[PDB]
Design a binder for these strands. Structure first.
Lengths: 82, 124, 92
DNA sequence: AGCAGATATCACTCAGCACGA
DNA sequence: TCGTGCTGAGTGATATCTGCTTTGGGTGGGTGGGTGGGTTGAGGCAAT
């Protein structure tokens, strides 16, 4: 029981840290942000957290990107060597 | 898409429409005053009176500079003439006489920033 | 049959690139003793991420880093550039 | 016309070797 | 143990072609259902 309570508290802290990334209003509220680069060009982001925070805005900008660089992993089946 | 030779020249009709809008009188021109009112956000609807077009055609014929029958062309095919009249009005919209809050409108800001971005791209 | 976009040495050496970093990177970046370490790290990453985004939008940040690594290892012109930089600074 | 499944032809990564340093 | 190609076939990936089916209405049916819509008019039946 003591370990279960400690783990529940750990999960509670993790959820609390996660909460800052969630919007109080529903998804379809529809807030649009415009962020100004050092040069006079504006980028568009969506979400309340984007308007209220900047680090969240850049994280979303990053996250929204589609292109992924290939990662090749050298996997050896243990059953192959017996 | 085989072609046909119809007896209508839209360029001459557009010139007719522009001349009617600019010069027609019935003070200054009635439609010029209407466009001035529209520019100042005082009017949101412009109505073209076919009677005015007929009177203008009669006056032009009397003066000897006979012009195309615009009333019949409008009546026979009105969908195209709506766009033609809109283009003619746009090409001769007077500058506003009453200052307005341009920055309030979203479209004004968006188009201004598009112009800025285009200028930056061209400078590149 | 479509040419892919790559972070070529050409790109890196353009006006928007390494010369851009040298021209204006000390002004924007600032490591503060009165600020938290995480804040300073985030500020540095912020500057370099915006520069990267400007330069090469296709990739993410980390991906960008990796690409940079490979380019720098491979390209001989980039190497020259770097050496040039270093030399010119050592002469001051 | 639009959409979902599929074929096939397009590159890119780690792989490794010869020279010389 | 760095740099610069030359080789290389493997492991992708993304730019690129091959076949439904649909609206709704009986010019797909009642071995797809009637709680996915249509549907007002006539007809037969039981409780009244």
């Amino acid at each position: 029981g003591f370990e279960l309570s400690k783990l529940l508290q750990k999960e509670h802290q993790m959820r609390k840290n996660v909460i800052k990334h969630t919007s109080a209003r529903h998804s379809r509220f529809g807030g649009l942000l415009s962020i100004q680069t050092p040069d006079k060009t504006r980028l568009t982001v969506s979400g309340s957290q984007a308007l209220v925070d900047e680090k969240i805005a850049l994280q979303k900008l990053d996250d929204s990107k589609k292109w992924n660089k290939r990662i090749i992993k050298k996997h050896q089946s243990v059953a192959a060597e017996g | 898409l085989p072609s046909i030779q119809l007896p209508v020249d839209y360029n001459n009709l557009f010139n007719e429409i522009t001349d009617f809008l600019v010069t027609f009188k019935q003070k200054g021109p009635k439609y010029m005053a209407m466009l001035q009112k529209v520019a100042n956000r005082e009017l949101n609807s412009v109505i073209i009176d076919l009677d005015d077009i007929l009177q203008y055609q009669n006056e032009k014929f009397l003066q000897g500079t006979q012009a195309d029958d615009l009333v019949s062309a409008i009546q026979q095919n009105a969908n195209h003439f709506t766009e033609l009249f809109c283009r003619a009005i746009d090409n001769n919209m007077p500058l506003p006489t009453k200052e307005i809050d341009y920055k309030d409108d979203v479209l004004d800001v968006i188009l201004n920033q598009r112009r800025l971005r285009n200028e930056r791209m061209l400078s590149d | 049959r479509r040419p892919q976009v790559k972070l070529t040495a050409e790109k890196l050496l353009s006006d928007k690139g390494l010369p851009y970093v040298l021209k204006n990177a000390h002004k924007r970046i600032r490591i503060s003793s009165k600020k938290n370490s995480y804040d300073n790290l985030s500020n540095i990453i912020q500057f370099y991420q915006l520069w990267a985004h400007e330069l090469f939008p296709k990739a993410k940040f980390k991906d960008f880093m990796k690409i940079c690594q490979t380019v720098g290892k491979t390209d001989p012109v980039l190497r020259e550039y770097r050496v040039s930089l270093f030399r010119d600074e050592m002469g001051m």
